[PDB]
């Protein structure tokens, strides 16, 4: 098992090819071991993902507009939330081009996709509370006036700090 692992949790092939590709290049540059999420839901087994998350020390939860279309991604967040409550990992919420309140209160396009995917599902309530609580962890914001390269450096800094602290 690897044990200076950073888990990068998110969805979107466009996000993987763009912003995340730079974040990944900067982490590797700093010899930090990272695990990339199944961003296409190309069907890596859910138990493998949830286990990788548990084996991590850091999780970067990158909330984008596509996060709530995936039942598996939402299950990952639940697992994130469960693990932080047992104290086995540092979680850092990243808000990619949406406001945190949008996430917390499941507003707009973000929540509409969530409500559509979770219609008539028993676990809906528990999921709703996770989205309400994870954005209270300190976290990092990226809006359209943000200099992305600076935000990448800011995230890498937070990761270095968290890793020395463990």
């Amino acid at each position: 098992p690897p044990q200076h692992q950073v888990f990068i949790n998110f969805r979107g092939a466009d996000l993987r090819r763009r912003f995340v590709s730079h974040l990944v290049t900067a982490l590797k540059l700093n010899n930090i071991n990272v695990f990339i999420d199944d961003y296409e839901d190309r069907g890596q087994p859910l138990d493998v993902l949830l286990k990788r998350i548990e084996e991590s020390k850091i999780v970067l939860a990158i909330f984008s507009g596509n996060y709530t279309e995936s039942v598996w991604c939402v299950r990952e967040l639940e697992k994130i939330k469960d693990c932080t409550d047992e104290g086995t990992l540092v979680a850092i919420p990243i808000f990619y081009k949406l406001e945190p309140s949008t996430v917390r209160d499941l507003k707009g396009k973000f929540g509409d996709r969530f409500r559509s995917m979770a219609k008539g599902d028993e676990r809906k309530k528990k999921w709703k509370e996770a989205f309400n609580l994870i954005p209270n962890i300190m976290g990092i914001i990226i809006d359209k006036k943000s200099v992305e390269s600076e935000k990448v450096n800011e995230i890498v800094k937070a990761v270095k700090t968290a890793l020395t602290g463990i």
Binding site: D14, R17, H22, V24, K145, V147, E150
Partner: protein
Amino acid sequence: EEFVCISCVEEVRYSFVSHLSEALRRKGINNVVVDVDIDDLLFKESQAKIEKAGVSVMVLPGNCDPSEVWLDKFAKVLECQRNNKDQAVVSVLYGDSLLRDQWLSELDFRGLSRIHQSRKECSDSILVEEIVRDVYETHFY
């Protein structure tokens, strides 16, 4: 001393181009970013910077119609290569839905050949890498 000038529209200024500028900077290559969405009035300061740049990098909005974009925004950047004949020009067609042929045609008409393109198979990070290597080779050239 010697430096590189990146030209682009505003939509990419804070995303793709910032990564591009950061990458050059890590490699020890000084650079400045010029926004071409500015009209010819404030642009008069930026003309100065482009002219003394050794390498001028044009990051084009490849999803857009070149006929609706070239003359309006980038003609003025290319026209700085006249004053400095030592200056080399690098062109980047950036975008997730390129009007690839329209732009290749435009670039040919203006006489530009040193060209990089967005591809669905490569990340923007790889694209940045390819451009930094080209610039570096041209930078001491």
